[PDB]
Ligand binder design. Structure first.
Ligand code: NAD
Ligand code: NAD
Lengths: 284, 282
């Protein structure tokens, strides 16, 4: 009876790995919090937030299709989340709601944890969806000199443009958006890049048999390559990077660090990352 | 995949409901989790918004929201309408049903000892949540007469009106006597099968008293029930036991009340003997 509730507001909720990860981390540390998932869409989201406040829930993770909508229900968003226009985390600080995007802080935390310094580097970002804008937003916020966002001409292209505009106009980070079709612009981008980051669905099943990088000669050792895809754990892009001497960061790195960021936001304590890693079976 | 079952009250710190329900849930491996939420009259309406939006299976309700909660359910039981307060809400696809298991619980605890409430005469001490719950249910289930005594406080008037609702909707006879009429108390008692305390007397910081100043108001063979369960053995029960007469304690009510809630939420049978032992109610 002394535990606070932390939710997950989304629909569907069947395939989430947050519940087990947060709860196992919580048990390990013996903290007075319980994590539960709830089926919430755009129509019930407003009443769910009223519940969050009335019941004094500690917070809630947020997923499709409520991430953009949730931005309208918090009192405060971080500068990175305002760039993104979407949050996956809400923290209830005694009635005052703070909105965060731990996908961006997590991925950026995973990078730093490897001993890589973000400040002033050049990132070649593939995609402009939820993972990519969150990643680039935080990256800009933490000092990236430039971001060479490459996105095909699909339903996300204009999104890339506004994102670049927002990041450009609100940060000292220089973002350019280039059409993926221009392979030479891509070749020059990669050569000048310190980090290659895939935030697209390419690499994830069923498309598990492809990368946005046609030839490994396009990559150069010394380049750090990060992957958002965690299914499969070993993407084609990752294998290219490992077959080119590049240092790497897999999907599990972002997933675990992202979970950590949420955990600390809600508990104030450090996340037992190695433990959660083994317990969830992300080690093999 | 688990559904939430809450408790909406303030305070919540002392409630034994969370442990009982979660022990019972865990014993059967049921896909539900019970959790207490600190909620009062001002946050109750938003908390109900939350029960619907989050799709909770339901929620237990305790002070100070039992009366207010009746205005937030789509449907209430006949007993609940007589009491004017509920301790239980069940959410059936957005449709909310209110029940007062405190009534059914106490009555079930009585029937369970081997005693039949039909046609009997109960001397009912009190007019709060416990007493009106018990009286409502007891009346509905064939109680011939309810003689309730209450001091001249804020619950006296509530007692009068309560009596009226019951007297008007049941075949039960209910009277309201000033607890200060020591004579009527001994007399209206004299002819009684059941003595039931629903007041706070017996519970700390009133653990040294009883509303029974004499045993000659007790015919050892009589039935004395106590709502108080802190302490387990109240002075009113300690007298009764030494008096020789048979009694039903607060634990009986607590467990049967909890059982009803559990079955309403889960559809399963409550593991009462297990919870009893685990809770150390033995
Ligand atoms: N590791 C983690 O913690 C984590 C967290 C979030 C998302 N992800 C993963 O990251 C990936 C992206 O998810 P999201 O939510 O941002 O997706 P999203 O639907 O919001 O956007 C997908 C992006 O991929 C690009 N894309 C898709 N197919 C493409 C193709 N064939 N060629 C070129 N571009 C293509 C789109 O233009 C778009 O910019 C998914 O694999 C998801 O599983 C991982
Ligand atoms: N065992 C269970 O399941 C269960 C359930 C509910 C309540 N309870 C217990 O029942 C008792 C009553 O709780 P409630 O919710 O009905 O309280 P309540 O506030 O609603 O009503 C209190 C009643 O006690 C009377 N009273 C208070 N002090 C008195 C005094 N000094 N002398 C005479 N009468 C006095 C009042 O007039 C009133 O009628 C408490 O001990 C509570 O813990 C037990």
């Amino acid at each position: 009876a002394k535990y606070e509730l932390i939710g997950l507001m989304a629909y569907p909720i069947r395939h989430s790995l947050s519940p087990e990860m947060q709860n196992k981390a919580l048990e390990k540390a013996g903290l007075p919090f319980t994590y539960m998932a709830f089926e919430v869409d755009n129509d019930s989201f407003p009443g769910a937030i009223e519940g969050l406040k009335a019941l004094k829930m500690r917070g809630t993770g947020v997923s499709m299709p409520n991430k953009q909508l949730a931005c309208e229900y918090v009192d405060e968003l971080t500068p990175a989340a305002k760039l993104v226009g979407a949050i996956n985390t809400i923290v209830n600080d005694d009635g005052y709601l703070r909105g965060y995007n731990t996908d961006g802080t997590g991925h950026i935390r995973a990078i730093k944890e490897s001993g890589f310094d973000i400040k002033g580097k050049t990132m070649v970002l593939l995609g402009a969806g939820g993972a990519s804008t969150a990643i680039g937003a935080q990256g800009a916020i933490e000092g990236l000199k430039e971001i060479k966002l490459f996105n095909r001409r699909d339903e996300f292209f204009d999104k890339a443009l506004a994102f670049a505009q927002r990041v450009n106009e609100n940060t000292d980070c220089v973002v350019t958006v280039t059409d993926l079709a221009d392979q030479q612009a891509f070749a020059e981008a990669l050569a000048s890049a310190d980090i290659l980051t895939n935030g697209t669905k390419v690499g994830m099943k069923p498309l598990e048999n492809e990368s946005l990088v046609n030839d490994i000669s396009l990559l150069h050792p010394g380049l750090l390559v990060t992957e958002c895809v965690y299914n499969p754990h070993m993407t084609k892009l990752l294998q290219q990077a490992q077959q080119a001497g590049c240092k790497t960061i897999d999907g599990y790195g972002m997933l675990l660090w992202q979970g950590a960021e949420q955990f600390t936001l809600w508990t104030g304590k450090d996340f037992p990352l190695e433990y959660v890693k083994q317990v969830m079976g992300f080690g093999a």
